């Protein structure tokens, strides 16, 4: 496939809800969108980095620069027989997996479309519907927490994830467990702990959580391995998994027994397939993470989540929970705990251009 | 892709040289050949198992039974969206990777053909010629060894592999190394050693071999890991690597630092790609192994050997060194240390049915 | 002993009950039977492999080929002073322990008969009755499970083994434990788990099961060792123990604290004696596993189960639970939890030839 | 087999050479001889313990008391189906393996005789001649050492063992190695070192010795394991290997890579066969050790040395190097590096009662 042209845009998309972060509260998403054109087809890619480096180090500004002035010029007009070629073309540039992912994923979409197949089929998927889990923030009280969990269980979610922190973990989780003895419950420890809190984390073992996500430093594997050795509960890694080498080291160290997969965090689908092979060979369950994606990112996530190693519910809930209006024509809605994979070749969604234009803050067209 | 029909044959092809084994000297290959038919296309697969279980446990008879009465009946006429679907269909059957490989590799060929692409492109390859290494059995003398090695070096081979054994390792290898200080030299220790021979093997460290292949038991990883920790020379695993789980365990234990990849030994291309991801994530070099294949197998090996993790020369020399006449129309011949990947969709070779019929000992046609 | 002739048969023997497997439900056994003739005596061997490679990799077809065309021709007419000679004669052939076991065990029977002694006496046994345990599959409900366990306890079984799987383990086992506080209870985890399920398996520690059999991969030792390190409950290995070297590695790794011995799985009595020496030297209890054997296999198992290291009840229950008609004249029936060892030289049972002929699907006589 | 009666004697046989020990120079062997009578047959056993506890803790006096007043009274007239029954009968008595060995080995002889077979055949042997190595004490000089070694090499011995000690190891061994570059050379470090001497011992790695025997404490495994990890030369264990449990622990710790087997040190053939299974399962070579035995012991050693795991030459040289007259009619003489196993049922030798009576210091006959 020879990429003939590319269009990069920065969009500002309003969120239906408002959520708090480590730097105030966020109410909108600034999204880097990429369209790749080749052989009369169009591949789509969506950035998961934000304006501030809060989840991790990249920003929309930094990724925009790399894509516009380094990565697209590197691949425009080049004959790339497959996604591996694209990966090798970007190999000299260190880090920046999310910026690379926008292009790598858009290209995988374009390639799958040129092959005439749905993306999941090309990636090696084995299902066309994904189980849905939900994530809840820290609530004002134990009562409020039970209320929210009960409603989400009534709606059909197949796993409930609750945010915790020192001083707000055992009691609230224990109350939920007692009220819902058979619910699949997980904790998002949000890198709010250190090995100093080992006893507090071990205390959660009696609650039978499916896993405790990223309790220690966001870029750590060694201390998580020390922690995991002491817990019967699986430690699930998210921010620490930036690529296949880290996944390999996590397995060698025993740093986590469950992996949260976010393709963009990893650098794209090529890297995700490598992580999938690694996890599958070690019996490590995978589930699809969410990053408040608009329709393009959500569809990419759904196609990748069809792989055999994804055996646990992912954060791929209805687009309507996030956006009053999504950027694709499709209504990506789940029901009875399942989210179908959008039909069609590639990622199976189509941009709603007039709306996209209306929410474009900046744009640039480049041709080979 | 739905497999509409399949033809299985057992062929007998005389080799141009005498091949020493653990139970006799082999002069012919008994080959299980598979043709898969679907959507007007033909996928080709070739078995690497033999009449006797000498290299490993499978036999032509055992594999013929599984393919004819178990595997083909299970997949004939079924909708297989991709190779992963085929993998899952055969999952209930334990072991027998070479028997599964005939079908799985023939299917990958058919699938790539249905996608309209060369197999290497679908597998993630990044090159179209593979570096060629040569293998040498134990010679009557050191002078003879030197003579043969010198000849192969003049011929352009990029790696020389010498079979060794207790009592015939250090002096012969040391003589070759002194005569050819810059040559890439390798040893095939042929499972001829035990940890009792640790000293003899460690003595080879001074010769700067590129790797020592499978010196200990054919189904071991633990003792090889103990050996590897004592040697600076990389231990290369062959028979021990039967699948991705063994490869993951080899990485955890440090059982070897180079992997010999034989797709059929692993169960096919799907399994090889998983091993590739694992090796690549640990910086473990791969090279394509050989099993005296006729043209279909040699072509499959070439397409897989194009992947990025294959960084050392493979046993993919000219078909003419093996056969007076091969079963494919193409002349798979190397030149100046390089073997081109045959062009065309899928594996790129075509069977010469008239010659195939003349060397067919048995055949069966099956349709959905 | 010089083997003068051998007769191999494939029999189809109806099962009184019908049991479910990983590929539908089975209702009959396809049995490879071997008769070895020498010095006017006859040794008997029975294959435990089936038509499909579900328990492990071998099949009746694959073993038939090896015995008829490779192994019997290798030993017919050869002077074999003892079973060790037979083992060395087959050493060049890798794997296929069950196919080798048919011949090795038949020969051990013939040898013991030529020595004029019962097989147990020659193998080093110290008892003439074996304690009997029973194995139950997954039942429709906890109530049904209690019902079945209670009846088997009334009948006098000395150990009850219950099949479990993720989602069906703690609650059912806990209910049985509570209803029968002093019963010897074990779990057959049927390779249905991975290290991901560590917490679920550790949770069983409070139930005081005598052991949990083969919870992880069928060909694994490394992950079972990691699991065992976390459990007070002994992990019992079955499929992973394919020979003495694996038993040695299991001891080095601490992969299991109890071993299920199935002589055919191991390659025969010679290999079983080696495993017995290894286990006994590490204080690892042994018990006799069952593979739905007809009278020949059951008698072999009983004679081997007399060894000192077998300190726990085995799956050697009455032949009448399996067959409406067995292939030997003897009625191998247990009572009050004990199964006597059949009397006479060698394995002490005699073929009921007319019946055997009636259930023969194929046969072949070969002479030296 | 029921032992109907037993005759125990203490003999004194003058040696043809002076034997250096830790407390005097020995010129005579004081031998505990046992004759077991049953079913008209006679089993022979010979003690390897001496008057002083120099090699290990037992003495002729201590062993005489145990056999005469404890072991024989316990087994006389009892039905012993096999050697395992004898083993269990003596189980309550701790240690004293050499005293138990006289009875256990005499019983194995009687049992094999009752079965009508050569002892090696019943033990699982696969050969009828054993390779012969020779031992040399510390000589007055390096030249003397060279002279002796040269002579033994001309004589056909297949391994040369040289006693060494701190201050007399590297230079003497290096001189021998230079003079005989191809000779199989071994060292008997005689428990003369400690980990304090790690450097002196590691210095020997360059000499390519086949093994270094028992350099550290006679009852140690832990320190030898620490030493072995630092040496490429295999450490060979002798005094430390008192039974199968110690052998299992030596394998777990990696305390040695070669085992010297002396059946009496181990408690007999039953224990030796267990050690054999352990060593074989770990690829640890065995060789038959010597204890200056008269003909009965030398014959027992030869029959046991036929087992497959014995792959290195043993100290089983000609009886004539030790005795002007031996206690058996047979002339146990080696030729061209090989010692034949004496023919006949059991150990194959016959006592010359007249000579035995002349060298008897004490005797006692006991009947059931």
From Swiss-Prot, chains A, B, C, D:
Binding site for Mg(2+): 188, 213, 238
Catalyses which reaction(s): (1R,6R)-6-hydroxy-2-succinyl-cyclohexa-2,4-diene-1-carboxylate = 2-succinylbenzoate + H2O
EC number(s) from the headed UniProt entry: 5.1.1.-, 4.2.1.113
Assembly with partners or alone: Homooctamer. Tetramer of dimers.
Cofactor: a divalent metal cation
PANTHER family: O-SUCCINYLBENZOATE SYNTHASE, O-SUCCINYLBENZOATE SYNTHASE-RELATED
One example of a Gene Ontology biological process annotation: menaquinone biosynthetic process
Active-site residues from the entry: 163, 262
SMART domains according to UniProt: MR_MLE
A GO molecular-function annotation: O-succinylbenzoate synthase activity
UniProt protein name: N-succinylamino acid racemase
Source species: Thermus thermophilus (strain ATCC 27634 / DSM 579 / HB8)
Annotated cofactor note: Binds 1 divalent metal cation per subunit.
Family per record: Belongs to the mandelate racemase/muconate lactonizing enzyme family. MenC type 2 subfamily.
Function comment: Acts as a N-succinylamino acid racemase (NSAR) that catalyzes the racemization of N-succinyl-L-phenylglycine. Also converts 2-succinyl-6-hydroxy-2,4-cyclohexadiene-1-carboxylate (SHCHC) to 2-succinylbenzoate (OSB). Catalyzes both N-succinylamino acid racemization and OSB synthesis at equivalent rates. However, NSAR activity is probably the protein's biological function, because menaquinone biosynthesis genes are missing in this species.
Keyword DNA repair: no
Record keywords, A-Z: Isomerase, Lyase, Magnesium, Metal-binding
InterPro entries documented for this protein: Enolase-like_C_sf, Enolase-like_N, Enolase_C-like, Mandelate_racemase_C, Mandelate_racemase_N_dom, OSBS/NAAAR
């Amino acid at each position: 496939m020879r990429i003939e042209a590319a269009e990069l845009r920065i969009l500002e998309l309003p969120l239906k809800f408002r959520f708090e972060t480590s730097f105030g509260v966020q109410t909108k998403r600034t999204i880097l969108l990429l369209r790749l054109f080749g052989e009369g087809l169009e591949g789509l890619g969506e950035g998961v980095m934000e304006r501030l480096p809060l989840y991790r180090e990249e920003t929309v500004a930094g990724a925009r620069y790399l894509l516009e002035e380094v990565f697209l010029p590197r691949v425009l007009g080049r004959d790339l027989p497959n996604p591996e070629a694209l990966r090798e073309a970007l190999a000299p540039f260190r880090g920046n997996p999310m910026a690379k992912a926008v292009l790598e994923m858009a290209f995988f979409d374009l390639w799958a479309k040129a092959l005439g197949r749905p993306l999941w089929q090309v990636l090696g998927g084995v299902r066309q519907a994904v189980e849905v889990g939900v994530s809840l923030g820290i609530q004002p009280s134990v009562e409020d927490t039970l209320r929210v969990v009960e409603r989400h269980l009534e709606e059909g979610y197949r796993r409930i994830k609750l945010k915790i922190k020192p001083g707000w973990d055992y009691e609230v989780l224990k109350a939920v467990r007692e009220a819902f003895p058979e619910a699949t419950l997980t904790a998002d420890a949000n890198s709010a702990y250190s090995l100093a809190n080992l006893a507090q984390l071990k205390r959660l073992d009696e609650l039978r959580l499916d896993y405790i996500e990223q309790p220690l430093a966001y870029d750590d594997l060694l201390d998580h391995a020390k922690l995991q050795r002491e817990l019967s509960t699986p430690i699930c890694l998210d921010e620490s998994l930036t690529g296949a080498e880290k996944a390999r080291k996590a397995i060698e160290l025993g740093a986590g027994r469950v992996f949260n997969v976010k393709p963009a965090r990893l650098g794209g689908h090529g890297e995700s397939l490598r992580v999938h092979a690694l996890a599958e060979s070690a019996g490590i369950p995978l589930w699809m993470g969410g990053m408040l994606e608009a329709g393009v990112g959500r569809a990419h996530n759904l196609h990748l989540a069809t792989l055999p190693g994804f055996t646990k519910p992912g954060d791929v809930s209805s687009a309507s929970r996030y956006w009053e209006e999504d950027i694709v024509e499709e209504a990506l809605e789940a029901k009875d705990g399942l989210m179908p994979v959008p039909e069609g070749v590639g990622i199976g969604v189509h941009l709603k251009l007039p709306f996209v234009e209306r929410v474009t803050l900046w744009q640039r067209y480049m041709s080979a």
